[PDB]
Amino acid sequence: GPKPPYSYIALITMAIQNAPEKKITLNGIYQFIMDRFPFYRENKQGWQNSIRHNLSLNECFVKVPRDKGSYWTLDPDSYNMFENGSFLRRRRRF
DNA sequence: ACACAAATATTTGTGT
DNA sequence: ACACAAATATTTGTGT
Ligand SMILES: [Mg+2]
Numbered sequence: 001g002p003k004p005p006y007s008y009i010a011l012i013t014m015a016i017q018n019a020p021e022k023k024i025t026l027n028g029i030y031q032f033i034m035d036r037f038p039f040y041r042e043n044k045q046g047w048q049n050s051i052r053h054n055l056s057l058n059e060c061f062v063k064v065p066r067d068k069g070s071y072w073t074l075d076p077d078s079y080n081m082f083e084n085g086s087f088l089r090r091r092r093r094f
Numbered sequence: 095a096c097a098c099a100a101a102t103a104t105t106t107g108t109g110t
Numbered sequence: 111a112c113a114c115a116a117a118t119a120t121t122t123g124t125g126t
Contacts, residue, residue: 025123049095056124069101069122 003039008047008054010087012061016074016082023064023071026052 006014015032016024024032030048033040040047055061060078064071081090 034104046095052121052123053125055122063123068103 001039004037007090008050009058009060009090010052012054012072013074013081014087016061016072017079020048023073025068025071026055027068029072040073 012029012035015029017030018024018032029051030044052083055063055072060081061072061076062075064073077094082086082088083091
């Protein structure tokens with residue numbers, strides 16, 4: 001149906017915070033979004049590219065090696081970018 | 095969006 | 111059958 005009101009940055013931040021170890025792979029981010037938001041079960045090419053692009057562009061998502069590919073985590077300075085927990089409004093940079 | 099490299103995964107080929 | 115190497119395919123990550 002309609003696309004949810006959350007930005008790609010909010011979606012990634014939801015997935016990272018939802019992981020028990022606060023670290024998650026890229027496919028884990030795909031699965032999180034598709035499980036909770038049916039709009040993203042279609043045309044995966046497009047938005048999954050936008051997910052990868054948002055992971056590399058924004059400093060707030062830092063890549064970390066494992067112990068498949070790599071774990072994505074939140075910079076602690078940006079862990080609560082969405083202060084009220086609704087993920088509708090994002091705090092701006094210090 | 096695009097192109098593209100780098101890193102992994104899968105399929106195919108060869109020898110025994 | 112197996113082990114293993116080559117070659118391809120796919121995913122992951124980065125740069126305008
Ligand atoms: Mg980044």
